[PDB]
Design a protein around this nucleic acid. Sequence first.
RNA 1: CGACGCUAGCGUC
RNA 2: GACGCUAGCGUCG
Length: 651
Amino acid sequence: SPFKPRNYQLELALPAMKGKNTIICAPTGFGKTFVSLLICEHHLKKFPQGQKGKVVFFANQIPVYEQQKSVFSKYFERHGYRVTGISGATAENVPVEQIVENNDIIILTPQILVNNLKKGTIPSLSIFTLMIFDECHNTSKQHPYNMIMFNYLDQKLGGSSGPLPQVIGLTASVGVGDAKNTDEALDYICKLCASLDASVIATVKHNLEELEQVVYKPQKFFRKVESRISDKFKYIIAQLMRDTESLAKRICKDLNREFGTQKYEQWIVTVQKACMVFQMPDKDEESRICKALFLYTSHLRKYNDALIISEHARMKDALDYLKDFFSNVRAAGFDEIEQDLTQRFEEKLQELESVSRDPSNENPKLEDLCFILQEEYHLNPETITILFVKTRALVDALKNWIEGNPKLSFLKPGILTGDHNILIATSVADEGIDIAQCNLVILYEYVGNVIKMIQTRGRGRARGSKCFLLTSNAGVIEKEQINMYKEKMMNDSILRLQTWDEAVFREKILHIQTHEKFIRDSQEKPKPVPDKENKKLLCRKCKALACYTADVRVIEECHYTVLGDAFKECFVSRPHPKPKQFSSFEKRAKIFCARQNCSHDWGIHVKYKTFEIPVIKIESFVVEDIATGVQTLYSKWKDFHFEKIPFDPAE
RNA sequence: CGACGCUAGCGUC
RNA sequence: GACGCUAGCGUCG
Ligand SMILES: [Mg+2]
Ligand SMILES: [Zn+2]
């Protein structure tokens, strides 16, 4: 152990080194990696000569996986332990069984292990002696962590009595979920402890003073401000809205309406979702009326978003956003509909710009953020900032404004989504891999949970780091208020736990956990009857025939193909700007409607073992029926019931 | 393609 | 006290 550990690290690691299933709960940045390494070195120094240990470490983000894989193999080969890892890119056509056998420390994404557990390639978890979940707080509803633990609990409660592994979770906090007093919070923490069969929660108690000189708590600030006094854009855009919806009335004629909400977008998603069953006797003019109206609603949706961007940013940015929109749809073909909508746009456009570009009109949010930045960089010209927005439209809007606003010449921004002065960002899953210490973080119209709150403090470990929350909605302020109270209750409940006898707590967890077992068994739902009939699937933006269900076979129960040239008729392949690959496929194209003026996104095109195939999404089509004539929309594939004819290579 | 998590809004016993 | 739907965001096979 020659790299100088601190006493709070040994204090956290101690119970794990005593063999107890343990949840380490410590502030982001305490150095969990050293704790994991110490625990592992100890775990497998323990064994006699005739037995050997096998450790598995789960990370569920690739950078963390690669980082841990690297540091584990560097620390452990000197001691004689084969280290290896498996992730999505390295998973296929390799006999995972003997990879696991042949190696003593094993770093995994969790999905690969549930996938191997279910296909029996991995018989039981009794293969492992120690399991380590990094960011274990999402050992919760459907997350792969929980599916692994379900397998563990099954072996626990069933008569099958193989030796089970020791389970350690690491986290900066446990969450309380939707808990509103200390006893509810207590219950939720006990439920999560049960999910990982933990007997101990390790926090820092004796060496608090050492810890609080390592990771400091940044000071928080709330900036309540109010929305735009004057809405010129909103007047004229509203008028555009009710024009387009009068067009809806001209063909649809069928119905609390607020223009600019998430009310409004859910309503418009509903008008599309209800209008893809417009069934006439004529089929030609019905295809084109229904798509007149799909287009009207798509344009109304991207009309609405423009004004939410107006509320949260400049209006020159929203303007550039929908000028990009119209350049986008210009290349999708030209009908009467395109020229018509776009031409009423042209009419408004110039008064529109004249509205946008006048200093008269500034979102007070933007000038308050300019204020904050000016102050922090006047007092510290070397401040490194990070700014969290909600939509990824807002990220490049704010960036363009930073460069375009001259007050902040001294800012040189950089992005990250899914050198520098300041980073603009949406959300980063869970604490994350190494990042430059930021000493200023700002949350711009930000809402979140308690765990994200604890974790965001790790950007500003150093003393004198600062964090701002600025908003036009007292809602958001109150919503982080309740979060801080939730952190209070979490700490209070954890300490109330540690003052219980071990055994009372362990029989508590055992009973919680047999409960939840028979719950998930009861909740196991049986099949309905799959119906065996010839169903037509038509497009969603042209409603033209695509194929029937007897055309489609299914591949490993998830992705569904088509056979026969009847599909090669009605799409066009487009080589893709993101040639990703996932488990046993390679992605090369996205396929769209070959129909003139349609070009809707229908699926992708991909190499599977020796074949090229396109594979498609339901929630990009409509499903009719021969005798009924009626048609119905499905979103999720698993939601759709018919004869599941598996893919045969024999054709 | 598909599986999950977080958030907001809205519903069901 | 959970489930579902719509969307935003993130991750992963
Ligand atoms: Mg996740
Ligand atoms: Zn189409």
